[PDB]
Protein backbone atom coordinates (compact mmCIF):
# COMPACT_ATOMS: atom_id res chain seq x y z
CA UNK A 1 0.00 0.00 0.00
CA UNK A 2 1.28 3.50 -0.80
CA UNK A 3 2.68 5.28 2.26
CA UNK A 4 3.57 8.98 2.12
CA UNK A 5 5.71 10.44 4.89
CA UNK A 6 4.48 13.98 5.56
CA UNK A 7 4.95 16.77 8.10
CA UNK A 8 1.74 18.53 9.14
CA UNK A 9 3.48 21.65 10.49
CA UNK A 10 6.60 22.99 8.77
CA UNK A 11 8.37 26.31 8.45
CA UNK A 12 8.79 26.08 4.67
CA UNK A 13 6.02 26.69 2.13
CA UNK A 14 7.57 24.52 -0.60
CA UNK A 15 7.45 21.41 1.60
CA UNK A 16 3.72 21.92 2.20
CA UNK A 17 3.12 22.49 -1.51
CA UNK A 18 5.01 19.32 -2.46
CA UNK A 19 3.18 17.22 0.13
CA UNK A 20 -0.20 18.49 -1.04
CA UNK A 21 0.85 17.91 -4.67
CA UNK A 22 1.61 14.25 -3.89
CA UNK A 23 -1.65 13.87 -1.94
CA UNK A 24 -3.64 15.51 -4.77
CA UNK A 25 -2.10 13.19 -7.37
CA UNK A 26 -2.83 10.12 -5.23
CA UNK A 27 -6.41 11.23 -4.56
CA UNK A 28 -7.17 12.14 -8.18
CA UNK A 29 -6.31 8.77 -9.75
CA UNK A 30 -8.23 6.55 -7.25
CA UNK A 31 -4.90 5.28 -5.91
CA UNK A 32 -4.81 3.27 -2.68
CA UNK A 33 -2.66 5.14 -0.15
CA UNK A 34 -2.12 6.03 3.51
CA UNK A 35 -0.28 8.90 5.21
CA UNK A 36 2.10 8.86 8.19
CA UNK A 37 2.99 12.05 10.08
CA UNK A 38 6.68 12.24 10.98
CA UNK A 39 6.11 15.04 13.51
CA UNK A 40 3.42 13.15 15.43
CA UNK A 41 5.42 9.92 15.85
CA UNK A 42 9.17 9.86 16.47
CA UNK A 43 9.77 6.16 15.76
CA UNK A 44 8.25 6.33 12.27
CA UNK A 45 10.48 9.29 11.41
CA UNK A 46 13.56 7.47 12.73
CA UNK A 47 12.59 4.39 10.69
CA UNK A 48 12.18 6.65 7.65
CA UNK A 49 15.72 7.99 8.17
CA UNK A 50 17.36 4.56 7.94
CA UNK A 51 14.95 3.29 5.27
CA UNK A 52 16.49 5.69 2.73
CA UNK A 53 19.35 4.41 0.55
CA UNK A 54 22.52 6.38 1.40
CA UNK A 55 23.10 7.74 -2.11
CA UNK A 56 19.94 9.90 -2.09
CA UNK A 57 20.66 11.96 1.01
CA UNK A 58 21.08 15.71 1.11
CA UNK A 59 24.71 16.47 1.87
CA UNK A 60 23.48 18.83 4.60
CA UNK A 61 21.21 17.69 7.43
CA UNK A 62 18.22 15.37 7.57
CA UNK A 63 16.31 14.34 4.43
CA UNK A 64 13.28 16.28 3.25
CA UNK A 65 9.82 15.16 4.53
CA UNK A 66 8.01 14.07 1.31
CA UNK A 67 8.95 10.41 0.78
CA UNK A 68 6.95 7.64 -0.95
CA UNK A 69 7.01 3.93 -0.09
CA UNK A 70 4.90 0.92 -1.02
CA UNK A 71 4.88 -1.73 1.67
CA UNK A 72 8.42 -1.50 3.01
CA UNK A 73 10.03 -1.01 -0.45
CA UNK A 74 11.08 2.53 -1.37
CA UNK A 75 9.80 4.46 -4.40
CA UNK A 76 11.35 7.92 -4.23
CA UNK A 77 11.22 11.55 -3.14
CA UNK A 78 9.30 14.43 -4.73
CA UNK A 79 11.93 15.08 -7.42
CA UNK A 80 11.85 11.52 -8.79
CA UNK A 81 8.05 11.74 -8.60
CA UNK A 82 8.14 14.85 -10.80
CA UNK A 83 10.53 13.15 -13.24
CA UNK A 84 8.17 10.17 -13.50
CA UNK A 85 5.21 12.57 -13.74
CA UNK A 86 6.55 14.24 -16.86
CA UNK A 87 8.10 11.06 -18.30
CA UNK A 88 4.69 9.31 -17.92
CA UNK A 89 6.32 6.50 -15.91
CA UNK A 90 4.30 7.04 -12.75
CA UNK A 91 2.81 3.58 -12.22
CA UNK A 92 6.24 1.98 -12.59
CA UNK A 93 7.60 4.57 -10.14
CA UNK A 94 5.05 3.72 -7.45
CA UNK A 95 5.11 0.04 -8.45
CA UNK A 96 1.40 -0.47 -9.15
CA UNK A 97 0.57 -2.27 -12.38
CA UNK A 98 -1.28 -0.15 -14.92
CA UNK B 1 -17.03 56.41 -40.69
CA UNK B 2 -19.67 59.13 -40.51
CA UNK B 3 -22.01 56.91 -38.46
CA UNK B 4 -19.27 56.24 -35.89
CA UNK B 5 -18.56 59.99 -35.73
CA UNK B 6 -22.23 60.70 -35.03
CA UNK B 7 -22.37 57.94 -32.40
CA UNK B 8 -19.27 59.32 -30.65
CA UNK B 9 -20.82 62.79 -30.80
CA UNK B 10 -24.15 61.58 -29.39
CA UNK B 11 -22.41 59.79 -26.52
CA UNK B 12 -20.38 62.95 -25.82
CA UNK B 13 -23.30 65.32 -25.37
CA UNK B 14 -25.36 62.61 -23.62
CA UNK B 15 -22.68 62.21 -20.92
CA UNK B 16 -22.12 65.97 -20.87
CA UNK B 17 -25.90 66.36 -20.46
CA UNK B 18 -26.08 64.20 -17.33
CA UNK B 19 -22.97 65.93 -15.94
CA UNK B 20 -24.37 69.42 -16.56
CA UNK B 21 -27.85 68.56 -15.28
CA UNK B 22 -26.48 67.00 -12.09
CA UNK B 23 -24.19 69.99 -11.49
CA UNK B 24 -27.10 72.39 -12.07
CA UNK B 25 -29.32 70.46 -9.64
CA UNK B 26 -26.55 70.48 -7.02
CA UNK B 27 -26.03 74.24 -7.45
CA UNK B 28 -29.77 74.99 -7.23
CA UNK B 29 -30.20 72.85 -4.11
CA UNK B 30 -27.09 74.42 -2.55
CA UNK B 31 -28.21 78.04 -2.95
CA UNK B 32 -31.80 77.19 -2.00
CA UNK B 33 -30.80 75.41 1.23
CA UNK B 34 -28.51 78.37 2.04
CA UNK B 35 -31.51 80.70 1.87
CA UNK B 36 -33.48 78.16 3.89
CA UNK B 37 -30.78 78.17 6.60
CA UNK B 38 -30.86 81.97 6.76
CA UNK B 39 -34.64 81.94 7.17
CA UNK B 40 -34.45 79.29 9.92
CA UNK B 41 -31.87 81.29 11.90
CA UNK B 42 -33.90 84.50 11.63
CA UNK B 43 -36.98 82.59 12.81
CA UNK B 44 -35.20 80.99 15.79
CA UNK B 45 -33.73 84.24 17.16
CA UNK B 46 -37.26 85.42 18.04
CA UNK B 47 -37.90 82.36 20.24
CA UNK B 48 -34.52 83.01 21.86
Amino acid sequence: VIRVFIASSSGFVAIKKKQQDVVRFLEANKIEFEEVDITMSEEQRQWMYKNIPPEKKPAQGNPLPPQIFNGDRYCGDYDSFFESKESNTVFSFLGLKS
Amino acid sequence: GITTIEAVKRKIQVLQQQADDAEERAERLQREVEGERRAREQAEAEVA
Partner: protein, 130 residues
Protein backbone atom coordinates in the same frame (compact mmCIF):
# COMPACT_ATOMS: atom_id res chain seq x y z
CA UNK C 1 -32.93 69.25 29.23
CA UNK C 2 -34.65 72.23 27.61
CA UNK C 3 -31.85 74.62 28.62
CA UNK C 4 -29.38 72.28 26.93
CA UNK C 5 -31.63 72.51 23.87
CA UNK C 6 -31.60 76.30 24.25
CA UNK C 7 -27.79 76.38 24.26
CA UNK C 8 -27.72 74.02 21.27
CA UNK C 9 -30.11 76.47 19.60
CA UNK C 10 -27.77 79.36 20.43
CA UNK C 11 -24.65 77.63 19.09
CA UNK C 12 -26.60 76.39 16.06
CA UNK C 13 -28.06 79.75 15.02
CA UNK C 14 -26.08 82.71 16.34
CA UNK C 15 -22.47 81.47 16.10
CA UNK C 16 -22.91 79.90 12.66
CA UNK C 17 -24.73 82.95 11.29
CA UNK C 18 -22.04 85.32 12.59
CA UNK C 19 -19.38 83.11 11.01
CA UNK C 20 -21.21 82.86 7.67
CA UNK C 21 -21.60 86.66 7.44
CA UNK C 22 -17.84 87.23 7.52
CA UNK C 23 -17.13 84.15 5.39
CA UNK C 24 -19.39 85.19 2.50
CA UNK C 25 -18.37 88.86 2.51
CA UNK C 26 -14.64 88.08 2.76
CA UNK C 27 -14.85 85.53 -0.07
CA UNK C 28 -16.63 88.08 -2.27
CA UNK C 29 -13.97 90.67 -1.39
CA UNK C 30 -11.08 88.28 -2.15
CA UNK C 31 -12.58 87.30 -5.52
CA UNK C 32 -12.14 90.83 -6.89
CA UNK C 33 -8.53 91.04 -5.67
CA UNK C 34 -7.59 87.71 -7.24
CA UNK C 35 -9.41 88.53 -10.50
CA UNK C 36 -7.64 91.90 -10.77
CA UNK C 37 -4.18 90.31 -10.67
CA UNK C 38 -5.32 87.36 -12.78
CA UNK C 39 -6.70 89.69 -15.47
CA UNK C 40 -3.30 90.28 -17.11
CA UNK C 41 -3.12 86.60 -18.09
CA UNK C 42 -6.16 85.06 -19.84
CA UNK C 43 -7.60 83.74 -16.57
CA UNK C 44 -10.68 84.39 -14.46
CA UNK C 45 -12.27 82.97 -11.30
CA UNK C 46 -16.00 82.35 -11.01
CA UNK C 47 -15.93 80.38 -7.74
CA UNK C 48 -13.03 80.79 -5.32
CA UNK C 49 -13.36 77.33 -3.76
CA UNK C 50 -13.70 75.28 -6.96
CA UNK C 51 -11.16 77.10 -9.15
CA UNK C 52 -8.19 76.87 -6.73
CA UNK C 53 -8.66 73.11 -6.51
CA UNK C 54 -6.57 71.97 -9.49
CA UNK C 55 -3.66 74.13 -8.33
CA UNK C 56 -2.55 75.38 -11.76
CA UNK C 57 -4.17 78.79 -11.30
CA UNK C 58 -2.61 79.18 -7.85
CA UNK C 59 0.74 78.70 -9.61
CA UNK C 60 -0.41 81.35 -12.10
CA UNK C 61 -1.21 83.67 -9.17
CA UNK C 62 2.20 83.19 -7.54
CA UNK C 63 3.96 83.62 -10.89
CA UNK C 64 2.08 86.86 -11.60
CA UNK C 65 2.69 88.38 -8.16
CA UNK C 66 6.33 87.28 -7.83
CA UNK C 67 7.19 88.02 -11.47
CA UNK C 68 9.64 85.12 -11.26
CA UNK C 69 9.54 81.76 -12.96
CA UNK C 70 7.90 78.90 -11.02
CA UNK C 71 8.47 75.19 -11.73
CA UNK C 72 6.44 73.85 -14.63
CA UNK C 73 3.05 72.38 -13.62
CA UNK C 74 2.65 68.64 -14.02
CA UNK C 75 -0.06 67.63 -16.49
CA UNK C 76 -2.58 65.04 -15.31
CA UNK C 77 -6.26 64.60 -14.47
CA UNK C 78 -5.74 62.50 -11.33
CA UNK C 79 -6.18 63.62 -7.73
CA UNK C 80 -2.48 63.08 -6.97
CA UNK C 81 -1.47 65.35 -9.87
CA UNK C 82 -3.59 68.10 -8.29
CA UNK C 83 -1.98 67.34 -4.91
CA UNK C 84 1.52 67.70 -6.35
CA UNK C 85 0.55 70.86 -8.26
CA UNK C 86 -0.74 72.48 -5.05
CA UNK C 87 2.37 71.24 -3.22
CA UNK C 88 4.57 73.12 -5.71
CA UNK C 89 2.87 76.43 -4.89
CA UNK C 90 2.95 75.68 -1.16
CA UNK C 91 6.68 74.92 -1.35
CA UNK C 92 7.30 78.15 -3.27
CA UNK C 93 5.40 80.07 -0.59
CA UNK C 94 7.39 78.31 2.15
CA UNK C 95 10.76 79.14 0.58
CA UNK C 96 9.68 82.80 0.28
CA UNK C 97 9.63 82.98 4.13
CA UNK C 98 5.83 83.23 4.26
CA UNK C 99 4.58 81.35 7.33
CA UNK C 100 1.76 78.82 6.95
CA UNK C 101 0.65 76.06 9.31
CA UNK C 102 -2.26 73.60 9.19
CA UNK C 103 -1.94 73.92 5.41
CA UNK C 104 -1.64 70.88 3.18
CA UNK C 105 -2.16 69.94 -0.43
CA UNK C 106 -5.13 67.75 0.49
CA UNK C 107 -6.65 70.65 2.44
CA UNK C 108 -6.76 72.77 -0.73
CA UNK C 109 -7.84 69.84 -2.93
CA UNK C 110 -10.61 68.88 -0.50
CA UNK C 111 -11.91 72.47 -0.69
CA UNK C 112 -11.91 73.43 2.98
CA UNK C 113 -13.38 76.93 3.21
CA UNK C 114 -11.41 78.26 6.19
CA UNK C 115 -8.01 77.09 4.95
CA UNK C 116 -8.52 78.38 1.39
CA UNK C 117 -9.66 81.76 2.69
CA UNK C 118 -6.75 81.83 5.14
CA UNK C 119 -4.28 81.05 2.36
CA UNK C 120 -5.65 83.89 0.22
CA UNK C 121 -5.61 86.24 3.23
CA UNK C 122 -2.01 85.32 4.10
CA UNK C 123 -0.99 85.87 0.47
CA UNK C 124 -2.64 89.31 0.63
CA UNK C 125 -0.98 90.21 3.94
CA UNK C 126 2.56 88.85 4.06
CA UNK C 127 3.60 88.40 0.42
CA UNK C 128 5.45 91.29 -1.24
CA UNK C 129 4.03 92.62 -4.50
CA UNK C 130 7.35 94.16 -5.77
Amino acid sequence: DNDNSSARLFERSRIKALADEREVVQKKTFTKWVNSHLARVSCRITDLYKDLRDGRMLIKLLEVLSGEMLPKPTKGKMRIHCLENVDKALQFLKEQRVHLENMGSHDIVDGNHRLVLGLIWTIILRFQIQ
